[PDB]
Write an enzyme that holds these catalytic residues in place. Sequence first.
Site, PDB file in Angstrom:
ATOM      1  N   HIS A  52       0.826  -1.193   0.000  1.00 33.49           N
ATOM      2  CA  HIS A  52       0.000   0.000   0.000  1.00 33.49           C
ATOM      3  C   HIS A  52       0.873   1.261   0.000  1.00 33.49           C
ATOM      4  O   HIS A  52       0.497   2.295  -0.562  1.00 33.49           O
ATOM      5  CB  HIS A  52      -0.963  -0.012   1.195  1.00 33.49           C
ATOM      6  CG  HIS A  52      -1.799   1.214   1.359  1.00 33.49           C
ATOM      7  ND1 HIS A  52      -2.724   1.639   0.424  1.00 33.49           N
ATOM      8  CD2 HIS A  52      -1.878   2.097   2.359  1.00 33.49           C
ATOM      9  CE1 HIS A  52      -3.311   2.745   0.841  1.00 33.49           C
ATOM     10  NE2 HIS A  52      -2.821   3.042   2.013  1.00 33.49           N
TER      11      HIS A  52
ATOM     12  N   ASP B 148      -0.583  -7.593   1.130  1.00 36.88           N
ATOM     13  CA  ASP B 148      -0.007  -6.273   1.291  1.00 36.88           C
ATOM     14  C   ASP B 148       1.446  -6.358   1.730  1.00 36.88           C
ATOM     15  O   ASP B 148       1.787  -6.111   2.910  1.00 36.88           O
ATOM     16  CB  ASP B 148      -0.877  -5.463   2.250  1.00 36.88           C
ATOM     17  CG  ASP B 148      -0.504  -3.991   2.356  1.00 36.88           C
ATOM     18  OD1 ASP B 148       0.255  -3.519   1.488  1.00 36.88           O
ATOM     19  OD2 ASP B 148      -0.951  -3.316   3.317  1.00 36.88           O
TER      20      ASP B 148
ATOM     21  N   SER C  75       2.515   1.748   9.164  1.00 35.45           N
ATOM     22  CA  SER C  75       2.354   0.733   8.139  1.00 35.45           C
ATOM     23  C   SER C  75       3.620   0.516   7.314  1.00 35.45           C
ATOM     24  O   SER C  75       4.421   1.399   7.113  1.00 35.45           O
ATOM     25  CB  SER C  75       1.151   1.028   7.269  1.00 35.45           C
ATOM     26  OG  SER C  75       0.007   0.779   8.068  1.00 35.45           O
ATOM     27  N   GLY C  76       3.791  -0.765   6.926  1.00 38.55           N
ATOM     28  CA  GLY C  76       4.995  -1.292   6.338  1.00 38.55           C
ATOM     29  C   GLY C  76       5.969  -1.842   7.360  1.00 38.55           C
ATOM     30  O   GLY C  76       6.884  -2.565   7.005  1.00 38.55           O
TER      31      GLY C  76
HETATM   32  C1  LIG Z   1      -0.716   1.760   8.497  1.00 38.56           C
HETATM   33  O1  LIG Z   1      -0.202   2.927   8.476  1.00 38.56           O
HETATM   34  C2  LIG Z   1      -1.802   1.459   9.435  1.00 38.56           C
HETATM   35  C3  LIG Z   1      -2.081   0.168   9.861  1.00 38.56           C
HETATM   36  C4  LIG Z   1      -3.124  -0.107  10.726  1.00 38.56           C
HETATM   37  C5  LIG Z   1      -3.905   0.949  11.169  1.00 38.56           C
HETATM   38  N1  LIG Z   1      -5.002   0.763  12.030  1.00 38.56           N
HETATM   39  C6  LIG Z   1      -5.079  -0.035  13.126  1.00 38.56           C
HETATM   40  N2  LIG Z   1      -4.023  -0.722  13.511  1.00 38.56           N
HETATM   41  N3  LIG Z   1      -6.229  -0.182  13.738  1.00 38.56           N
HETATM   42  C7  LIG Z   1      -3.643   2.229  10.733  1.00 38.56           C
HETATM   43  C8  LIG Z   1      -2.596   2.497   9.882  1.00 38.56           C
END
Ligand SMILES: *C(=O)c1ccc(NC(=N)N)cc1
Lengths: 238, 102
Positions: free
Chosen positions: A41, A90, A186-187
Amino acid sequence: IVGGESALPGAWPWQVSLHVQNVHVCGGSIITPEWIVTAAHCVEKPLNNPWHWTAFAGILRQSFMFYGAGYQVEKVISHPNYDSKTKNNDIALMKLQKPLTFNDLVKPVCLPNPGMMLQPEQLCWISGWGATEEKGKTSEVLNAAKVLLIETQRCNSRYVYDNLITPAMICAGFLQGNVDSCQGDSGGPLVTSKNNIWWLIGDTSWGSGCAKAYRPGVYGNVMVFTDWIYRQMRADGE
Amino acid sequence: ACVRLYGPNFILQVYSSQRKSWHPVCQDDWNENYGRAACRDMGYKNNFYSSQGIVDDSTSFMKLNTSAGNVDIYKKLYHSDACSSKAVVSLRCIACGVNLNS
Ligand SMILES: *C(=O)c1ccc(NC(=N)N)cc1
Ligand SMILES: *[C@@H]1O[C@H](CO[C@@H]2O[C@@H](C)[C@@H](O)[C@@H](O)[C@@H]2O)[C@@H](O[C@@H]2O[C@H](CO)[C@@H](O[C@@H]3O[C@H](CO)[C@@H](O)[C@H](O)[C@H]3NC(C)=O)[C@H](O)[C@H]2NC(C)=O)[C@H](O)[C@H]1NC(C)=O
Ligand SMILES: [Ca+2]
């Protein structure tokens, strides 16, 4: 990271900060001097091209990641079966132009082997520079938190993610909320210790909101992607 | 080559489609140079960390054919019920998985 604590130097030496336009966008995990695991993503168009990306390793604070001292990314490879709608599969790889110098603060996490035999609610750690509250700004400081795996059957229940969790995904966190990944994490890694080795179990992927009850974190299931990773690393240059 | 490192002790295994089963590699005649070739086949380039024999926690084994030519390492293995060395290959391609508290 919501509800975590500042990382210590060398606690998470595989963690990188991935920058675009001189700011943190995503996390990643070092697996070799040249290869980083991250989320597909993160590298959707228009950020699919390597030229956008620099990696910062061994540095806890964003304000100490100086323009021009990052490692330039040479190659981006997104999983062929990534589906942006569902976030299934992902996972992505980044290859650095120049190999990292491993030391006490920069070193790789192990790829997970089949047959890890983790506990249903294995104790794991997540780390990153994500927001420390839903809708928050990037964290200046690297944070980390303990999370448990959440059994896929529970995570797929009607009151949680209602059949959205595929075999290429794993859930972690707490169904009461309060401790979780968030935007910017994320990542990055979901890791666990077994047999005195730290293993990359997941890559931080998605979830509804952050740290909300019944809305835990969803991670790419790195176990299912290891053979793809091996094949990409082997193909490179060949 | 359908191959894996299995479990937290990195047991090298090869798949048999005929048996629909995974088999560890006998330590017989194995050495670190074979270890290095296996790591290269798994995409680790010039990374290598260790190859040692361990006790296997499977009956049927893959055995190294010392009389094979210069073929890929996995074309040098064959099915054997017996492992004379009574150990199987544990293979680590890279020093990984250590931090502050290790
Ligand atoms: C990635 O930036 C990411 C992953 C997971 C979430 N949300 C939760 N862990 N609930 C936000 C952003
Ligand atoms: C260990 O390897 C020996 C060397 O074989 C070579 O390398 C291996 C890795 C493989 O690539 C082989 O195809 C290659 O030849 C093995 O000895 C060979 O065994 C094969 C039978 O599997 C044999 O093939 C016959 O060759 C004749 C001669 O032209 C041919 O007419 C026949 O059709 C083949 N026989 C059969 C079964 O139809 C070959 O000649 C052998 N080569 C030598 C140099 O003797 C050896 O078997 C193997 N060890 C184990 C335990 O499997
Ligand atoms: Ca583009």
